[PDB]
Design a protein around this ligand. Structure first.
Ligand SMILES: Nc1ncnc2c1ncn2[C@@H]1O[C@H](COP(=O)(O)OP(=O)(O)O)[C@@H](O)[C@H]1O
Ligand SMILES: [Mg+2]
Length: 330
């Protein structure tokens, strides 16, 4: 499938605990139902997806969708599509606090690593364990934040200023002066991640709360160089992997007119793009995010989205909204 959609519900968080929230979400197979706390005597609205991940409890539970499970269904198949020579995208969509960052980057400890570190680890593992003198590889990475139409390099502490996305008259859009680093090992790319994740939550980021108002894009340029001993020449196969942690879907009160405008525009545009992609079996320039990722959202590409869901009753409206958004992706 060129477009896969999964939803994932998390355990209660602190706000919900202090609120004595009821769980209004239940799952069965590929189906997720949601109860309207103000109307308990109804039958819940139902939704069906490629995957409905029940992670509302914990790894101690036999039925708990772990980071490992999610990655092996969605992430693993994407990496394989990249080895086959084509571009891929994985988006985490949802309300602030619903579980987007946890699903994508997760935690630094044992057992809690998200899609990004698991995919990177898997990649280098397949590379180093590739036995063949004719096959060599190169892995380059970029990590940035898209906030109010401007780009922030997370791999360069003194990213002096806000870099613009530009459209090369022939080779496509790109971020000017954005750092792209060649990495030769996992611990090395892992170093970059930690370093970038660190930059997303420093104290200064609380001024404009960019951790929840900007889109975080982790890009990997995967190049496979194929040698051939007969008539001695290499053929390069380049795959682009974009792993995205979108801005909170609820900010699309207290939200500034322009932050909200851009975020709405971004999420709305991404939705049209994906629905179109799923249609095929497209206004890219309408937002910086969809503009920068156009090549990873083409007819050749493959995309998957994981929509994070809060379990509690207090977030019924935003959670329904997220489910509808995922349902439209198709
Ligand atoms: N499946 C999960 N298992 C354990 N903790 C989770 C899960 N999903 C989310 N969380 C916790 O919930 C909070 C919300 O997620 P992040 O913080 O992922 O928010 P957002 O969706 O805004 O990026 C974090 O404290 C995270 O540790
Ligand atoms: Mg987050």
């Amino acid at each position: 499938a060129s477009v896969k959609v999964a939803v994932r519900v998390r355990p209660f968080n602190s706000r919900e605990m202090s609120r004595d929230s009821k769980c209004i979400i239940q799952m069965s197979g590929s189906t997720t139902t949601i109860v309207n706390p103000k109307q308990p005597k109804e039958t819940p609205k139902s939704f069906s997806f490629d995957y409905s991940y029940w992670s509302h409890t914990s790894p101690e539970d036999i039925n708990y969708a772990s980071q490992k499970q999610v990655y092996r269904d969605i992430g693993e198949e994407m990496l394989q599509h990249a080895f086959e020579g084509y571009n891929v995208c994985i988006f985490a969509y949802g309300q602030t606090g619903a579980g987007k960052s946890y699903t994508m980057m997760g935690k630094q400890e044992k057992d809690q690593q998200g899609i990004i570190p698991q995919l990177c680890e898997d990649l280098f593992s397949r590379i180093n364990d590739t036995t063949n003198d004719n096959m060599s590889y190169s892995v380059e990475v970029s990590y940035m934040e898209i906030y109010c139409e401007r780009v922030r390099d997370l791999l360069n502490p003194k990213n002096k200023g806000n870099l613009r996305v530009r459209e090369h008259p022939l080779l496509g859009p790109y971020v000017e002066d954005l750092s792209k680093l060649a990495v030769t090992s996992y611990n090395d790319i892992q170093d970059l991640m930690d370093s970038g994740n660190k930059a997303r939550t420093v104290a200064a980021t609380n001024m404009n709360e960019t951790s929840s108002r900007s889109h975080a894009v982790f890009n990997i340029i995967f190049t496979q160089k194929r040698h051939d001993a007969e008539t001695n020449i290499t053929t390069e196969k380049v795959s682009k992997i974009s792993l995205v942690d979108l801005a909170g879907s609820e900010r699309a009160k207290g939200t500034r007119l322009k932050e909200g405008a851009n975020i709405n525009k971004s999420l709305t545009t991404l939705g049209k793009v994906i629905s179109a992609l799923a249609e095929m079996d497209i206004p890219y320039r309408d937002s910086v995010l969809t503009w920068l990722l156009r090549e990873n959202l083409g007819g050749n590409s493959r995309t998957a989205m994981v929509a994070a869901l809060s379990p509690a009753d207090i977030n019924y409206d935003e959670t329904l909204s997220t489910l509808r958004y995922a349902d439209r992706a198709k």
